[PDB]
Design an enzyme around this catalytic site. Structure first.
Site, PDB file in Angstrom:
ATOM      1  N   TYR A 196       0.819  -1.194   0.000  1.00 55.35           N
ATOM      2  CA  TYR A 196       0.000   0.000   0.000  1.00 55.35           C
ATOM      3  C   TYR A 196       0.865   1.262   0.000  1.00 55.35           C
ATOM      4  CZ  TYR A 196      -4.223   2.623   1.039  1.00 55.35           C
ATOM      5  OH  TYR A 196      -5.289   3.531   1.050  1.00 55.35           O
ATOM      6  N   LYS A 227      -2.766   8.316   3.513  1.00 55.06           N
ATOM      7  CA  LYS A 227      -3.912   8.131   4.379  1.00 55.06           C
ATOM      8  C   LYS A 227      -3.620   8.537   5.822  1.00 55.06           C
ATOM      9  CE  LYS A 227      -6.793   6.608   1.234  1.00 55.06           C
ATOM     10  NZ  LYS A 227      -7.976   7.431   0.738  1.00 55.06           N
ATOM     11  N   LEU A 285     -12.305   0.273  -9.497  1.00 53.62           N
ATOM     12  CA  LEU A 285     -11.262   0.618 -10.468  1.00 53.62           C
ATOM     13  C   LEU A 285      -9.859   0.905  -9.861  1.00 53.62           C
ATOM     14  CD1 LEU A 285     -10.951   0.632 -13.419  1.00 53.62           C
ATOM     15  CD2 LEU A 285     -11.292   3.146 -13.379  1.00 53.62           C
TER      16      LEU A 285
HETATM   17  N1  LIG Z   1     -11.651   0.101  -2.842  1.00 53.88           N
HETATM   18  C1  LIG Z   1     -11.061  -0.025  -1.649  1.00 53.88           C
HETATM   19  O1  LIG Z   1     -10.670  -1.263  -1.173  1.00 53.88           O
HETATM   20  C2  LIG Z   1     -10.754   1.108  -0.705  1.00 53.88           C
HETATM   21  C3  LIG Z   1     -10.570   0.782   0.638  1.00 53.88           C
HETATM   22  C4  LIG Z   1     -10.462   1.831   1.550  1.00 53.88           C
HETATM   23  C5  LIG Z   1     -10.518   3.161   1.114  1.00 53.88           C
HETATM   24  N2  LIG Z   1     -10.668   3.475  -0.218  1.00 53.88           N
HETATM   25  C6  LIG Z   1     -10.779   4.887  -0.635  1.00 53.88           C
HETATM   26  O2  LIG Z   1     -12.033   5.140  -1.255  1.00 53.88           O
HETATM   27  C7  LIG Z   1     -11.974   6.301  -2.054  1.00 53.88           C
HETATM   28  C8  LIG Z   1     -12.698   6.098  -3.387  1.00 53.88           C
HETATM   29  O3  LIG Z   1     -12.004   5.160  -4.181  1.00 53.88           O
HETATM   30  P1  LIG Z   1     -12.621   3.822  -4.840  1.00 53.88           P
HETATM   31  O4  LIG Z   1     -12.058   2.567  -4.355  1.00 53.88           O
HETATM   32  O5  LIG Z   1     -14.118   4.015  -4.826  1.00 53.88           O
HETATM   33  O6  LIG Z   1     -12.061   3.895  -6.339  1.00 53.88           O
HETATM   34  P2  LIG Z   1     -12.608   4.699  -7.635  1.00 53.88           P
HETATM   35  O7  LIG Z   1     -13.978   4.221  -7.913  1.00 53.88           O
HETATM   36  O8  LIG Z   1     -11.563   4.425  -8.622  1.00 53.88           O
HETATM   37  O9  LIG Z   1     -12.691   6.249  -7.240  1.00 53.88           O
HETATM   38  C9  LIG Z   1     -11.605   7.092  -6.953  1.00 53.88           C
HETATM   39  C10 LIG Z   1     -12.044   8.475  -7.397  1.00 53.88           C
HETATM   40  O10 LIG Z   1     -10.957   9.357  -7.227  1.00 53.88           O
HETATM   41  C11 LIG Z   1     -11.153  10.355  -8.187  1.00 53.88           C
HETATM   42  N3  LIG Z   1      -9.947  11.173  -8.361  1.00 53.88           N
HETATM   43  C12 LIG Z   1      -8.659  10.750  -8.470  1.00 53.88           C
HETATM   44  N4  LIG Z   1      -7.882  11.854  -8.612  1.00 53.88           N
HETATM   45  C13 LIG Z   1      -8.666  12.957  -8.680  1.00 53.88           C
HETATM   46  C14 LIG Z   1      -8.379  14.315  -8.863  1.00 53.88           C
HETATM   47  N5  LIG Z   1      -7.120  14.755  -9.046  1.00 53.88           N
HETATM   48  N6  LIG Z   1      -9.438  15.195  -8.786  1.00 53.88           N
HETATM   49  C15 LIG Z   1     -10.734  14.758  -8.635  1.00 53.88           C
HETATM   50  N7  LIG Z   1     -11.004  13.411  -8.473  1.00 53.88           N
HETATM   51  C16 LIG Z   1      -9.978  12.537  -8.494  1.00 53.88           C
HETATM   52  C17 LIG Z   1     -11.500   9.570  -9.443  1.00 53.88           C
HETATM   53  O11 LIG Z   1     -12.113  10.376 -10.436  1.00 53.88           O
HETATM   54  P3  LIG Z   1     -11.676  10.218 -12.010  1.00 53.88           P
HETATM   55  O12 LIG Z   1     -11.821   8.732 -12.411  1.00 53.88           O
HETATM   56  O13 LIG Z   1     -12.576  11.164 -12.700  1.00 53.88           O
HETATM   57  O14 LIG Z   1     -10.179  10.504 -12.182  1.00 53.88           O
HETATM   58  C18 LIG Z   1     -12.427   8.509  -8.882  1.00 53.88           C
HETATM   59  O15 LIG Z   1     -13.749   8.960  -9.064  1.00 53.88           O
HETATM   60  C19 LIG Z   1     -10.488   6.567  -2.188  1.00 53.88           C
HETATM   61  O16 LIG Z   1     -10.140   7.595  -1.286  1.00 53.88           O
HETATM   62  C20 LIG Z   1      -9.835   5.273  -1.753  1.00 53.88           C
HETATM   63  O17 LIG Z   1      -8.549   5.555  -1.299  1.00 53.88           O
HETATM   64  C21 LIG Z   1     -10.825   2.445  -1.117  1.00 53.88           C
HETATM   65  C1  LIG Z   2      -2.218  -3.827   0.089  1.00 55.21           C
HETATM   66  C2  LIG Z   2      -3.584  -4.003  -0.533  1.00 55.21           C
HETATM   67  C3  LIG Z   2      -4.642  -3.590   0.468  1.00 55.21           C
HETATM   68  C4  LIG Z   2      -5.967  -3.343  -0.235  1.00 55.21           C
HETATM   69  C5  LIG Z   2      -6.105  -1.846  -0.448  1.00 55.21           C
HETATM   70  C6  LIG Z   2      -7.527  -1.337  -0.148  1.00 55.21           C
HETATM   71  C7  LIG Z   2      -7.670  -0.103  -1.027  1.00 55.21           C
HETATM   72  C8  LIG Z   2      -8.023  -0.232  -2.376  1.00 55.21           C
HETATM   73  C9  LIG Z   2      -8.114   0.908  -3.168  1.00 55.21           C
HETATM   74  C10 LIG Z   2      -7.755   2.164  -2.660  1.00 55.21           C
HETATM   75  O1  LIG Z   2      -7.929   3.278  -3.432  1.00 55.21           O
HETATM   76  C11 LIG Z   2      -6.860   3.792  -4.065  1.00 55.21           C
HETATM   77  C12 LIG Z   2      -5.598   3.183  -3.993  1.00 55.21           C
HETATM   78  C13 LIG Z   2      -4.524   3.721  -4.682  1.00 55.21           C
HETATM   79  C14 LIG Z   2      -4.669   4.886  -5.416  1.00 55.21           C
HETATM   80  C15 LIG Z   2      -5.927   5.504  -5.432  1.00 55.21           C
HETATM   81  C16 LIG Z   2      -7.027   4.980  -4.754  1.00 55.21           C
HETATM   82  C17 LIG Z   2      -7.423   2.285  -1.315  1.00 55.21           C
HETATM   83  O2  LIG Z   2      -7.074   3.494  -0.801  1.00 55.21           O
HETATM   84  C18 LIG Z   2      -7.349   1.144  -0.509  1.00 55.21           C
END
Ligand SMILES: NC(=O)c1ccc[n+]([C@@H]2O[C@H](COP(=O)([O-])OP(=O)(O)OC[C@H]3O[C@@H](n4cnc5c(N)ncnc54)[C@H](OP(=O)(O)O)[C@@H]3O)[C@@H](O)[C@H]2O)c1
Ligand SMILES: CCCCCCc1ccc(Oc2ccccc2)c(O)c1
Ligand SMILES: NC(=O)c1ccc[n+]([C@@H]2O[C@H](COP(=O)([O-])OP(=O)(O)OC[C@H]3O[C@@H](n4cnc5c(N)ncnc54)[C@H](OP(=O)(O)O)[C@@H]3O)[C@@H](O)[C@H]2O)c1
Ligand SMILES: NC(=O)c1ccc[n+]([C@@H]2O[C@H](COP(=O)([O-])OP(=O)(O)OC[C@H]3O[C@@H](n4cnc5c(N)ncnc54)[C@H](OP(=O)(O)O)[C@@H]3O)[C@@H](O)[C@H]2O)c1
Ligand SMILES: NC(=O)c1ccc[n+]([C@@H]2O[C@H](COP(=O)([O-])OP(=O)(O)OC[C@H]3O[C@@H](n4cnc5c(N)ncnc54)[C@H](OP(=O)(O)O)[C@@H]3O)[C@@H](O)[C@H]2O)c1
Ligand SMILES: CCCCCCc1ccc(Oc2ccccc2)c(O)c1
Ligand SMILES: CCCCCCc1ccc(Oc2ccccc2)c(O)c1
Ligand SMILES: CCCCCCc1ccc(Oc2ccccc2)c(O)c1
Ligand SMILES: N[C@@H](CCC(=O)O)C(=O)O
Ligand SMILES: N[C@@H](CCC(=O)O)C(=O)O
Ligand SMILES: N[C@@H](CCC(=O)O)C(=O)O
Ligand SMILES: N[C@@H](CCC(=O)O)C(=O)O
Ligand SMILES: N[C@@H](CCC(=O)O)C(=O)O
Lengths: 254, 254, 255, 255
Positions: free
Chosen positions: B155, B162, B194
């Site tokens: 990560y 974070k 994504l």
């Molecule tokens: N999926 C997981 O396991 C996980 C776990 C814990 C926390 N999170 C957190 O959840 C949040 C949402 O992510 P997600 O997993 O839902 O993935 P996601 O669907 O890929 O969404 C991430 C978003 O970030 C936006 N973004 C990136 N750079 C940007 C910029 N410069 N200005 C405006 N928007 C921007 C993207 O918009 P565009 O596509 O338009 O660039 C996209 O809509 C993130 O903070 C991620 O770190 C994810």
């Molecule tokens: C070690 C693997 C642990 C699993 C990670 C869980 C996770 C998934 C997607 C994430 O969104 C991102 C990640 C990178 C860049 C932009 C958004 C994120 O914060 C956390």
């Protein structure tokens, strides 16, 4: 919305009990409530307080959590009377007053163990028995204080009892997770209660919250009840093992 | 029940985005919703996703949070179109792929500073601007991951972004509290999105959640959304500077 | 401890009050060979004058602005050529505009936010990278942090978010360099009157709250940080990595 | 960390593998004088044998069962008459029944729960209250904990809730006794093959996970706990109190 839902609320002593604020919130959300009390006067008190709720009837059970058999029989009876439940709000703690001031290092074995027994172990046995009433899963919530995380002046033995509570909550979450039972804690900020009178220097802490906490104001019993409703409902699916501070943000500053 | 509430949801890219889970839940609770996006493709996906919501109006704004002028003008335009808001869901992070695997110690400066800028600073500026649309208070939630609190293999640079974001939440809660604006975080469990495809070893971690977390299952975007509703609503009054893990209890075990 | 035949790099002495000079007195007293890095020409002058108080038979001074990769890369390489391999790095470096260390955190500028992250946190990452080359057998790296990285402290503002970043940096570095037998830890120092502390708002108020409320009922000093630094830098603390040790009179443990 | 002219009480040696014997070898080698306390007569027999490998010129052995207030009280009183004033205590005492160290935590009995609290957490409070009488100038008390006190570790069960209690005990003692210049801290040791470890379910698979997953990719040993104890018990750690230092190859810092 908590219609067709049933929750057992432990630890109402009067109108100011944290558990009564928890009660009013769930009742207003349409839950059926069952109440458990220890002292005779808490029953009379309860009977009066129930007039403010919409519980069309008074389900009350005397249970001292120092007694295995009172806990076991009480929950067994609840099951006979009311059926399966959807979770338990635990709002029970005790320590001797002498222990709640002066020097923590002077705490007696007896007083140290009494606090542990009532304020921590009781969650373990309540969960064991309550589980029998939750075959499709449920939710258990215990009330703690920031004193369980940091040493706070005067809180003394109850601090070590709360730290014990908070780990009790993590180990139960892990044990009961496969049964779909979530176990969490609400770390309440300081609130004027019967038990609060017993703690050295309580009022100084009240004013300091106002001065120093992000929201610049104290929390009430209903604020704890609103967070109880979340933790006891499906809104908090996915959350277990957690401690949510309902304390105006005081936990987050220094 | 969020009827007559308005919220801004930042960072939907497609139907699997966490923020769209937030959206579905708030929409089902009767919130008016406003969406912000970076890429063209995300706006397209949003237009198509809005057909599944009861939002009677597309309120869509392009905001790249790397640009102050877009955040400043985005929000000012939002206030002109819908008036005052009750809170913001921030679901935005970014880092380069090669900073999500291999050795952390080889992270470039531009790589490190890029992840900080988008994934953390963005919250501060968003809070500053959104504040102008909350004269009576409201609530701001950002999305974080456990690898901000502990070093998780792979990560890497996003862990340090974070950790910075979670502090940002605490310093904002402290700053904006006297204005009755709560700031909190949800620490979501792994969810296929994504962005998650960018992260080395992600499938391994998903599987370990099922095997090791108290609930023995992974969470989904709707569960996050469910806790976002708690936080963005009054049910969570008194809660600020908090990090709530929606992660099946994984945070509590070791 | 004992530290003869060890060599440490100390980054961030500005004058006799720097926390890093507390480190230096302790290590020097313990027999270590010391190499010193500085940004301003005034810091070098102070260093030259402070060396007369130390048992070091040689000045090894290197200019290194940690905003520049090339200065870090070149600086460590030159160190390596001059003194051979090293046993650890004490990192005592941080920066933020005053425009930023008081009033409202919500008003922080993007440039001031990234400035503080770049100097106060990223520097450790690149330093660690470059110092590793001088530590084939293993070594120890220590950074200096403060409690405002774990909790929101009034006025510490932008620098709190940069300490949160730095403390995460230490954990990720610890994980990443562990297999190379390089430990990475943080000392969380209590408030100490230094040149940098002069630009933090409400600093004297905090000093006095420490005396009234911390378990030891007293503030700490640079030498106290040094003594823990000797611990973390030496074999005494083998087994200990990714750790943050509060040298703060117990203040972190109370509310 | 020269300890000549210091005296430390070490509580909880049972055999050569005990974490406390690690401490004893480290302290003894730094020239301290040691006093040992034991419960079972077999533990005294083992200390008599082990003292032959230490430099201590005389055996100072006291039976103290920490379940008895009178034994703790009279034992410390007697220690004070035999050796006079001490510099600190190393507490290495815990107990739980074996049923309660596997299977379902929710099935724990009241008696099993309170037993573990009594021996593993309360004993610290009363030891500090009685040892404080021997430390009019100040000193240092250090207890042994495990990560299981901070997170739920499968099988550690009732002992984790006792360690949570213990770790808070350390914080509340820190704040209470700080104005007496008595520092109180905890070492959170990684898994080590001892007699007590034989009783914990799943202990071997945890050892192996530490090698695979911890930053240093190896387990720690008793001497590594002893080295950090020498730091915590000595002047090197002035300014540190209410702290919990993880001696665990960094495992606490990763998820
Ligand atoms: N999926 C997981 O396991 C996980 C776990 C814990 C926390 N999170 C957190 O959840 C949040 C949402 O992510 P997600 O997993 O839902 O993935 P996601 O669907 O890929 O969404 C991430 C978003 O970030 C936006 N973004 C990136 N750079 C940007 C910029 N410069 N200005 C405006 N928007 C921007 C993207 O918009 P565009 O596509 O338009 O660039 C996209 O809509 C993130 O903070 C991620 O770190 C994810
Ligand atoms: C070690 C693997 C642990 C699993 C990670 C869980 C996770 C998934 C997607 C994430 O969104 C991102 C990640 C990178 C860049 C932009 C958004 C994120 O914060 C956390
Ligand atoms: N008020 C606060 O500032 C504050 C802050 C954070 C956390 N808390 C926690 O909130 C919970 C409730 O306390 P409160 O402030 O609401 O005070 P309270 O109204 O005085 O409640 C204490 C309750 O505990 C019950 N109790 C004590 N020992 C019991 C036993 N052995 N068996 C069954 N019940 C027993 C009492 O029952 P009887 O009267 O019938 O004996 C009483 O109903 C406690 O866990 C407390 O530690 C309080
Ligand atoms: N004082 C406290 O109460 C306190 C408490 C906890 C933690 N800390 C931390 O302790 C560490 C040392 O600070 P201090 O209090 O000792 O104050 P200090 O004496 O002012 O030292 C700070 C040092 O930072 C160096 N520095 C800043 N930017 C740099 C750059 N770009 N490249 C190279 N060096 C740079 C300065 O070097 P130049 O002079 O050459 O510019 C100076 O030597 C800092 O990380 C600080 O955040 C301080
Ligand atoms: N081994 C590990 O991986 C590990 C990891 C972290 C923390 N710890 C902790 O390390 C400490 C030392 O344990 P260990 O692993 O070294 O095991 P150990 O060698 O078995 O030592 C345990 C000690 O506890 C003493 N004891 C138990 N009940 C007592 C009582 N009522 N009164 C007086 N003494 C009593 C025992 O004395 P008698 O035999 O004479 O009864 C024994 O000397 C414990 O606190 C344990 O929780 C161990
Ligand atoms: C320094 C004091 C700070 C304020 C303490 C807040 C508080 C009030 C009431 C409590 O219930 C008790 C307390 C003692 C005994 C039984 C129940 C409690 O847990 C925490
Ligand atoms: C309310 C704050 C309470 C006291 C802050 C203690 C402290 C002093 C000096 C610091 O070095 C800085 C600080 C700012 C910029 C550069 C270096 C530092 O990290 C922490
Ligand atoms: C599944 C967890 C495996 C890793 C356990 C590490 C450990 C070993 C021995 C312990 O001493 C005890 C333990 C129980 C009873 C008395 C003393 C202890 O505290 C922690
Ligand atoms: N991302 C998956 C499946 C492709 C997808 O549908 O997104 C892969 O890497 O194969
Ligand atoms: N690409 C693999 C890990 C290997 C790598 O990142 O180089 C993954 O997505 O799990
Ligand atoms: N600089 C002042 C505080 C006022 C302010 O910075 O706004 C001080 O150091 O006490
Ligand atoms: N070492 C103790 C006191 C000095 C001594 O007794 O060794 C402390 O730092 O408090
Ligand atoms: N104690 C055995 C198994 C315990 C049990 O089956 O309860 C082990 O080494 O894991």
């Amino acid at each position: 919305n908590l219609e067709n839902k049933t929750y057992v609320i432990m630890g109402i002593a009067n109108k100011r009990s944290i558990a009564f604020g928890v009660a009013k919130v769930l009742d207003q959300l349409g839950a059926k409530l069952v109440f458990t009390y220890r002292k005779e006067r808490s029953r009379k008190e309860l009977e009066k307080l129930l007039e403010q709720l919409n519980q069309p009837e008074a389900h009350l059970y005397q249970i001292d959590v120092q007694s295995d058999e009172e806990v076991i029989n009480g929950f067994e009876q609840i099951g006979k009377d009311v059926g399966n439940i959807d979770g338990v709000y635990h709002s029970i703690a005790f320590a001797n007053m002498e222990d709640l001031r002066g020097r923590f290092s002077e705490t007696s074995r007896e007083g140290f163990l009494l606090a542990q027994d009532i304020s921590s172990y009781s969650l373990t046995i309540v969960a064991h028995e309550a589980k029998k009433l939750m075959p499709e899963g449920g939710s258990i919530v215990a009330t703690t204080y920031l004193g369980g995380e940091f040493a706070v002046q005067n809180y003394n033995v109850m601090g070590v009892a709360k730290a014990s509570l908070e780990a009790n909550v993590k180990y139960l979450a892990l044990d009961l997770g496969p049964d779909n039972i979530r176990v969490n804690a609400i770390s309440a900020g300081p609130i004027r209660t019967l038990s609060a009178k017993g703690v050295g220097g309580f009022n100084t802490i009240l004013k300091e919250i106002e001065e120093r906490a992000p929201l610049k104001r104290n929390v009430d019993q209903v604020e704890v009840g609103k967070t109880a409703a979340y933790l006891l409902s499906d809104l908090s699916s996915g959350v277990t093992g957690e401690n949510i501070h309902v304390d105006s943000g005081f936990h987050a500053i220094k």
